[PDB]
Design a protein around this ligand. Structure first.
Ligand code: DPV
Ligand code: DPV
Lengths: 34, 33
């Protein structure tokens, strides 16, 4: 998303975002189980 | 962004973003003094 620059920063951001998303998903599957 | 949840994660994202932006600004200032 910035060519080859800011690899470690882009990784960190990516990880934190994936975790917010994953945690929200878990909350939703507690809220509305199948 | 998400109320009071994910305080640490949002702080992390914000910081890394501010650092990317700072480096971009530095490069641009060197490119065009
Ligand atoms: C078009 C205007 C925007 C240009 C973006 C600024 C690019 C200049 C960044 C220069 C310093 C920050 O490099 P970085 O991310 O620590 O690199 C990681 C290691 N490499 C340098 C080998 C890739
Ligand atoms: C519809 C989508 C809603 C998603 C909301 C899911 C929230 C998930 C909560 C877990 C994520 C982290 O929060 P926490 O470390 O427990 O907060 C600690 C600080 N307070 C208690 C004051 C807030």
């Amino acid at each position: 998303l910035l060519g080859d620059f800011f690899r470690k920063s882009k990784e960190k951001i990516g990880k934190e975002f994936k975790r917010i998303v994953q945690r929200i998903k878990d909350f939703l599957r507690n809220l509305v189980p199948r």
